[model samples]
Target: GSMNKVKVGDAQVSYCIDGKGPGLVLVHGTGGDSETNWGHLMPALTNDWTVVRPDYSGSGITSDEGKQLEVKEIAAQVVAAAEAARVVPFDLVGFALGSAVVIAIAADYPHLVRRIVLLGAFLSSRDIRQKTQFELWRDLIRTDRAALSRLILLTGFSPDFISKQGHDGVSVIINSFVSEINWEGMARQVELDLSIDVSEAARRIEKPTLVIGCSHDHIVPSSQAKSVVRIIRGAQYTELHTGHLAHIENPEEFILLLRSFLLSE
Candidate 1:
């Protein structure tokens, strides 16, 4: 596997290309890069597929430019990444906030995506109290990122996970991520998610779909995930007994389940 760079619009995006088979694109969550998010899953995924994980506009080694971090903008970068890596008609997978970007891409550019998988997706503003607290967090990120990041980690995991893992475990997981996450980018992303009409968009997705939610997710609940599946006709939905950051907290199980889904057809 090797990392590569490409100019997408005004942004310089960095990505990793691995293996050799059918095309697959992996999108990471907020405050996470492709490498940090998908590193654990690559061992299993690379055996049967050519996986492309791009560091989106504001994270990792990618150049943020002055682009607004809207889902549509991120979705466009998804297409740019695929084209840059020469992976057409790829299988698209998104985790957490990335799920919204993938969904927006599917809705906007249906022909580019073959199948879609959404992990810890948010279906509605009401689902996550999007208006009030998210904005507060955005402000906190500007003033005290270290504290806000800690707060996010605390709320992101389930109560049981937090109890067992403690702050040290939380720090370990958080430390693995790229530390240059853009607060402005995150704020724009939150606004984009809040404004999206996901239900309406789901109706337009004509490709095969899978929605996976964590049972103990403190960020987006299982009910929100169920709503997404319900809106997208014939979509498969499943629940894992983990937290919002299940892919990090339980990478082995996450990879197992994800591989099964992506390889099913």
Candidate 2:
């Protein structure tokens, strides 16, 4: 499979389709595309299923008419891309803001989704802490992108993880973030992030669901993740000893947690 495109509303959504077996659609977070968010998890996932990863309007090569983005709109884009990639009744995995998007998908496009996995999830971005943080991010993106990158790195990882990465490693990661991230697109996404309220969607999820909360997550906070778990009836919950970026901070443990839940009978 290769990188492909599909017409979704005003945007030409870019996505990657590969592997075999059942469908698994991975939705990325703010400032991240298919590859940036889920590339590392693919090797473990692709072997068991045909993995489809979409680059929603605000990230990757997905081009749009620059209209305001909505959670439902992004969910539709994801559903469209999965259909184009030939996956329906697929298990869905979403990260950060993506967690909210997947919840929207499950709520609005129930037939298209099977199981669900939400990592670093939150009930809403309207939380005072989240609002302040993302607002600062929005501000920094406009005023000082360099500072924004540093802030993301700082809030995204746990103290231990950052310490382990060391000064040079951290600098390299920061440099990559500064060079690679779509600042303007992220600013737009921040607008969506600020307005996200997935309470209704979370309450409506009937499919098998797993919500993984990062114990040390500063970005979304473990409390919000727990709130999601409480809202989704019978949704199984687990905690990872990591940060907001759990996949990067503890991929082995994260994958183990995911597989045990998703692959279980």
Candidate 3:
């Protein structure tokens, strides 16, 4: 099927084009947008890779259609962006919940994905999904998005990182992030997280894959990242020193590891 540049069914997709090689898509974590998610990495990636970044419904400039969100929709959005950029069979990197969405995309359209990187990977672990906690997150999100913003800073980072951002520097980051969150769209994203599964589709993936585990990721356990990588046929795994927001907290190392894997042939 043909994909639109900034439209998926009734949704609005805000994406960007950067870099100049094979198609490389970067999908952000929950509540993450293209600018902040890959801001630091873009200059380097655009040096050699064609970067395609699409903001999902709830996360960034992308607007929602007031329809229920699905894993496939998120996946389709990424694919749509890549296609819009005229890049197919692209390599992809998925961070946090984005990891799950990319997995679904690759599983469904194996030919569209040439390589994969799952950072701070979730979705394989039921515990991390934590429907109960999501309810709490949902409440905080709808009632006080700012609090929801601050709350993620605690769970997403390690105790050490919090000490680094004692005055809530990370909270400022979250503050900017929260202001853009499409609550109605994000609510749908949360519910789908409870039932989304890409395992069966993953097992069929034979492309080169890298699974990144954050050593101190409090929300999605490192063990969970390890678990899914083990099941993804030939997928190899590595561990980063940061928490859930590894890329933001540690972009240098993240890019190094990612670049090596993407160039691994």
Candidate 4:
């Protein structure tokens, strides 16, 4: 297990490459790096596969000349990460904004991806609700990050899940975001999140695909995930009774769902 880098355009993408067996690449959401999104899932995943988690520009340790983030470019970095690890035709999983990136990758670079799993997937940011959410996120990153973290926690988890955390646990989670999150990178990702459009890519994707929606996700909403399922033709759809951050809210069910899909023939 090592943190590695690969050159993609002007960026030097950093990625974690470890474990053994088949390759599995994880793409993260807006305001998050690969580690933040997939760290917990890695233990379960790495036991059965070589997991590559890339930190695309604007998040984690990856560095680049500042520029607007594009789904295609980010997707390219993900492909480069797998290549750097000498892993090809890997199983791909993405969350939130990363869902769009994976969809683009599967559509444009089909040879490099095996199966695709997208959680909290959205087809585009054209919807008023989605657009407004990202816009507020961007503004908060510049004006008030503590508030941003609160907002994230408020919308990211289901009411039941948040209640279970209690006050102290919730405070810890919120504090971690305020202190650990890369607010500057998050601002950039917010911009990208607002500009995403994966309809064409979703339509073009030909791989075995699964789209999982959260029943209580206010951020992207199950309706958007349903649109993804509709557009992907043969893609299967399932729902977890959690919030947008279903993996965090219910790790056992999330891991079970993912393992069943990735392990199936």
| Regions of model 3 farther than 4 Å from truth | 1-4, 166-171
Whole-model lDDT values for every prediction: 0.78, 0.89, 0.79, 0.90
The candidate 2 region of ten consecutive residues with least summed lDDT is 255-264
Q: Which segments of model 1 are wrong by more than 4 Å?
A: 126-128, 174-180
Clashes of each: 0, 0, 1, 0
Query: Candidate 2 on 1-265: residue-level lDDT in tens?
Result: 6899999878999999989988989899999888778788788887888999999987999999998889889998999999998888799999989999999999888888889999999878888899999899889999999988888898999989899989899999899899988878888889999988989988888888899999889899999999999999999889999889998888888878768877778
User: How many clashing residue pairs are found in candidate 3?
Assistant: 1
> Residue 242 error for model 3, in Å?
0.9
State candidate 4's TM-score.
0.98
* Superposed Cα deviation of residue 113, candidate 4 (Å): 0.9
Error of 2 at 23 (Å): 0.7
TM-scores for candidates 1 onward, in order = 0.90, 0.97, 0.91, 0.98
Model 4 misplaced stretches (Cα beyond 4 Å): none
List model 4 lDDT by residue over 1-265, tens digit each.
8999899999999999878988999898887887778887778878888999999888898999989898889999999999889889799999989898999999999999899999999989899999888889888999999998999999999998889999999999999899888878888888888888989889999999999999999899999999999999799999999999998888888888878998877
- Candidates in order: C-alpha RMSD to true structure: 2.2, 1.0, 3.0, 1.0
Q: How accurate is candidate 1 locally (lDDT)?
A: 0.78
Query: How many steric clashes does model 1 contain?
Result: 0
